Amino acid sequence: DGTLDCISMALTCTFNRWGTLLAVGCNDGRIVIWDFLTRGIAKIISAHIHPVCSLCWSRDGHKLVSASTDNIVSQWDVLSGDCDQRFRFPSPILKVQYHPRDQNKVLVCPMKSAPVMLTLSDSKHVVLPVDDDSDLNVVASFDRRGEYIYTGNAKGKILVLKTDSQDLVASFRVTTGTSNTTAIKSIEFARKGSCFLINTADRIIRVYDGREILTCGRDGEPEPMQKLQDLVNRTPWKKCCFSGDGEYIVAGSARQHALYIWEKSIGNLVKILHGTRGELLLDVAWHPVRPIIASISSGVVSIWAQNQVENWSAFKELDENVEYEERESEFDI
Amino acid sequence: KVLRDNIQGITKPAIRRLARRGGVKRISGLIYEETRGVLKVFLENVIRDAVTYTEHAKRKTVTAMDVVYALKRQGRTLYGFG
Amino acid sequence: KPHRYRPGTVALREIRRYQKSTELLIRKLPFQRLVREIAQDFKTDLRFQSSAVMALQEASEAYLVALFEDTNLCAIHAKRVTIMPKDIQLARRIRGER
Amino acid sequence: TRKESYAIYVYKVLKQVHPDTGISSKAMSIMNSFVNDVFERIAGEASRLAHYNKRSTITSREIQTAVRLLLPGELAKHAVSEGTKAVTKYTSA
DNA sequence: ATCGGATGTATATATCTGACACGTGCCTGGAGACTAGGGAGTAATCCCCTTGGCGGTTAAAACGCGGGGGACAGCGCGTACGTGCGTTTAAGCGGTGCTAGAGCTGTCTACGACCAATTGAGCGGCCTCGGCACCGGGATTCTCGA
DNA sequence: TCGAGAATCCCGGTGCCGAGGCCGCTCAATTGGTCGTAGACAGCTCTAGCACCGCTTAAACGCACGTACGCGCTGTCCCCCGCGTTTTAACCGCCAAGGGGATTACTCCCTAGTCTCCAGGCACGTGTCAGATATATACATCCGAT
């Protein structure tokens, strides 16, 4: 539905705060900041020699946190492209995430170690707690306002901490239905409201409302707002995301390189988008204020927009025949 | 501990294994879930009736003799359980 | 050059060995979870005998192979080696299961 | 708890027919359940026919008639003859 | 795709009636009242099976992947089957008549019922050990390309 | 179609726990009176069955014949079999907690059993209309020409 030839080795992308720019990582380890309106590249940053697998914009949009595969995280000013700060860790980093309401702070999910929240002003770090002490794979994310931290382990356990004190404000373990746990693949939140989603190893996305987890307390049984899956193919989900408003949810079937689109309230599947059967789906993102969806597959990015009835359909356009309502004086002088 | 969707826990390999035991060569996909349904429906009765026994048994655990008398009442009696 | 047996042949031998074997062909735990799921529908938190659930699964699988058997037979009368859902439905129909 | 069964008599009649054979306790339980099944069957049928005959006394004639109702052909014939011989033997003393 | 004609079917009508609603006198099962035992209900105790979890394995399931194999659609023909009309035929009404056998009552008696006294056949429990299950390995035979 | 290869059969050997045998330890089987009674049996009805026979006729058998579904064959598609790989969770083994299941001991509420009396039910008459039946009629629907 529209691709870009000007970028190669697309690996990970991230919309800015207003959905005007897109920073995509490349295998060479370069940042390609490409613009939507001019439909061209806005910037090229020599980030790492190692490909970049995690990228996040700052709220003001002037900072981008990038993670190399060399366990090298670095902050870059979008105007200049300089490495503002640079750090390295053990247990290679799985993800970075700016704090949405404090760009000085940034959480980092490493591979084998617990996620740690650092600051840029001071090169300090706060290691977030781990429930089972043996997960070795815990994804973590700020909420919409950056007030709480949601951490999900490979054993389905879900901890909600407060971002400042790291104190356990809520907890619950998700189930595979019967009695078993499932590897929490990812935690996503809505940029609007409080609904969030969890991708798990059961290939079943679970949509909740964080207020219900907060009122559920520690070690409770919160039910999901929704349960979403491909009941037909039972396909895993490499990457999923909400819509900009938060009423549409998309999942990327890397198994068959497709895109499933459900709703939030009803949860019925909006639609499906099919990509090149030969392409391996890698990354998925939604335009924050547009029905536009960016996909990264086999190093190539594709764009999926959604237009209205007009752009040619605007006499007064009607859809179905209209019986004329004759009047009393319809034949009168 | 609320359970769900163990019906699909029935593997298509299991279904085709049972079919081969029944002496079947070629099978379509549309069967399995259909099969499953029937399965459910089938057991749909007995357990209830079984626990119905357990109902009158005034007990919390369910026993074999329950399903014994069920299959009996279901005209599908079984041996080897008292 | 790689060898592949003609279709059915492997499944044919599977049929032969399954009529040869007698044990169950269903994994225990999934069946048990299904049974308990069905149970909570009528009443929640009910316990069971392992003997009881073994009986459930054996008797089920027996009914199931009987259904597969006579549906195979019907499909013979349907002159096909592939099975059709309608065969199962009408079999239940003759089995008074409708 | 004193539980009653028949597996001992199963082993007995087995040796009576096959002295050099073993059984699975599973199979013994299956056979005993079968014993119970046929017993309840014949008993219910006999009581029902006696009810049809308004009889409150279930005797060997009822037994034979109900077996004939239940067993087919030579099965029934041999069973009738065997029960007849046995009751004759018991009545002989 | 329609109209016309043939035919078969739903309708109103009339009356006939024989089931059928209705009422009786007479019978006995049902109600009413009273006594006993003891099945059932409750409770405290024990056990112990179950339900729960935890970690390692892989056989098994998931999934993919050709691809020949048959499901299926179509197409010719032909034989077997509806049909309408012949034919002849037992089927049904019905009414007769005999009684063999149901179907009832009145004994009287053998026959479990039942209880009590007695106990050894049988059953829970404890060794035990050998067909049997598993395994590894060698030899046999089916099968798919010549 | 004679080999290659592959799944299988069989053989010997290993180790095991269920099959079995035996041992305490009863309660349920036996024995023997004893009693009221189920029915065995005799002996009556009467009626429903069983057969007889005639009369009418709707029904059955067969014919001819159109015809049209059954069947047989061809080619296509697709799709499910087979194999390869990758992932997983069933299983399996072990542990542990308790919560229910089963047990026993009391305790007594309810039912069986008895006796009394009668009133609802039942066999039995009795008018009587729901509907069966027949007829003419009006409507619906097929089948063939257009």
CB-hemisphere CA count at 13 Å for A48?
A: 24
Instruction: Look up residue D19 and give its DSSP letter.
Output: T
Amino acid residing at D3: K
Within 10 Å of residue C88's Cβ, how many Cβ atoms?
Answer: 24
Check residue A229 and give left, alpha or beta (phi > 0: left; psi -120 to 50: alpha).
beta
CA A47, chain centre distance (Å): 22
Instruction: Look up residue B62 and give its DSSP letter.
Output: E
Chains that touch C (3 or more CB pairs under 8 A): A, B
In angstroms, how far is E70 C1' from C75 CA?
14
- C48: the nucleotide nearest its CA (via C1') is E50
Q: What element of type H or E holds C15?
A: helix C9-20
Crossing angle (nearest 10°) for helices B64-73 and C50-77: 30
CA distances from A26 to A44, A256, A299, A323, D77 (A): 10, 23, 8, 60, 90
**Chain C residue with Cα closest to A178:** C33
CA distance A332 to D31: 100
- Sheet of A239-242: strand order equals A239-242, A248-253, A258-263, A269-274
CB burial of A213-244 (b: ≥16 within 10 Å; e: otherwise) equals beebeeeeebebbbebbbeeeebbbbbbbbbb
Reported resolution, Å: 6.2
Within 10 Å of residue A56's Cβ, how many Cβ atoms?
Answer: 22
β-strand partners of A261: A250, A271
SS3 B11: coil
Read off the tokens for D39: 């017993």
Which residue's CA lies closest to nucleotide E130 at its C1' atom? D22
Q: Are B24 and C68 in contact (CB under 8 A)?
A: yes
CA distance A303 to A196: 24
Look up tokens 């037909």; give the residue.
Answer: A232
SS3 C48: strand
Chains that touch D (3 or more CB pairs under 8 A): B
Q: Check whether residue C98 has its CB closer than 7 Å to nucleic acid strand F.
A: no
CA C54, chain centre distance (Å): 15
Query: A241, A249, A245: which is closest to A296 by C-alpha?
Result: A241
Q: Are A284 and A302 in contact (CB under 8 A)?
A: no
SS3 B61: strand
Task: Please give the tally of structural domains in chain D.
Answer: 1
CA distance A254 to A268: 21
CA distances from A80 to A42, A119, A162, B9 (A): 11, 21, 34, 55
Look up tokens 């997960």; give the residue.
Answer: A135
Q: Are A63 and A55 in contact (CB under 8 A)?
A: no
Overall residue count recorded for chain B in this entry: 82
Domain interval for residue D64:
1-93
Catalogue all structural domains in chain B, each as residue range(s) with its CATH number: 1-82 (1.10.20.10)
Q: Are A142 and A149 in contact (CB under 8 A)?
A: yes
DSSP collapsed to 3 states, chain A: CCECCCCCCECEEEECCCCCEEEEECCCCEEEEEECCCCEEEEEEECCCCCEEEEEECCCCCEEEEEECCCEEEEEECCCCCEEEEEECCCCEEEEEEECCEEEEEEEEECCCCCEEEECCCCCEEECCCCCCCCCCEEEEECCCCCEEEEEECCCEEEEEECCCCCEEEEEECCCCCCCCCCEEEEEECCCCCEEEEEECCCCEEEEEHHHHHHHCCCCCCCCCEEECCCCCCCCCCEEEECCCCCEEEEEECCCCEEEEEECCCCCEEEEEECCCCCCEEEEEECCCCCCEEEEECEEEEEECCCCCCCCCCCCCCCCCCCCCCCCCCCCC
CATH code at position D54 = 1.10.20.10
β-strand partners of A273: A259
Check residue B59 and give left, alpha or beta (phi > 0: left; psi -120 to 50: alpha).
beta
In angstroms, how far is F139 C1' from C98 CA?
39
**Residue A45 burial (C-beta neighbours within 10 Å; 0-12, 13-18, 19+):** buried
CA distances from C21 to A15, A130, B17, B24, C68 (A): 60, 49, 11, 16, 17
Instruction: Look up residue D29 and give its DSSP letter.
Output: H
- Sheet of A93-99: strand order equals A93-99, A102-110, A116-119, A125-127
Q: Which nucleotides in chain F have some atom under 7 angstroms from a protein Cβ?
A: 5-8, 18-21, 27-29, 38-40, 79-84, 88-91, 99-103
Q: Give the CATH fold of the C3-98 domain.
A: Histone, subunit A (1.10.20)
**Chain D residue with Cα closest to B80:** D30
Query: A224, A220, A170, A222: which is closest to A202 by C-alpha?
Result: A224
**Residue C35 burial (C-beta neighbours within 10 Å; 0-12, 13-18, 19+):** buried
Q: Which of residues 29-88 of D touch strand F (CB under 7 A)?
A: 50, 54-57, 59
Look up tokens 């029902």; give the residue.
Answer: D48
Contacting residues of B for C12, CB less than 8 Å apart? 25
In angstroms, how far is E115 C1' from D56 CA?
22
Beta strands in chain B (DSSP E): 61-62
CA distance A213 to B39: 37
Contacting residues of C for A179, CB less than 8 Å apart? 33
CA distances from A92 to A68, A74, A153, A156, A273 (A): 9, 14, 17, 22, 33
**Chain B residue with Cα closest to C13:** B20
Query: A88, A11, A19: which is closest to A57 by C-alpha?
Result: A19
β-strand partners of A140: A151
Read off the tokens for A16: 């800015």
CA distance D51 to D44: 10
Domain boundaries, chain C: 3-98
Q: Are A104 and A58 in contact (CB under 8 A)?
A: no
CB burial of D38-59 (b: ≥16 within 10 Å; e: otherwise) equals eeeebeebbeeebeeeeeeeee
Overall residue count recorded for chain D in this entry: 93
Within 10 Å of residue A42's Cβ, how many Cβ atoms?
Answer: 16
Instruction: Check B82 against D37: CB less than 8 A apart.
Output: no
CA distance A104 to A63: 10
Distance between first and last Cα of chain A:
57
φ, ψ for residue A133, nearest 5 deg: 65, 0
Read off the tokens for D91: 């009545």
CA distances from A157 to A168, A218, B57, B74 (A): 13, 11, 39, 44
Strands A138-142, A148-153: pairing kind: antiparallel
Q: Are A36 and A24 in contact (CB under 8 A)?
A: no
CA distances from A85 to A71, A73, A88, C38 (A): 14, 8, 11, 58
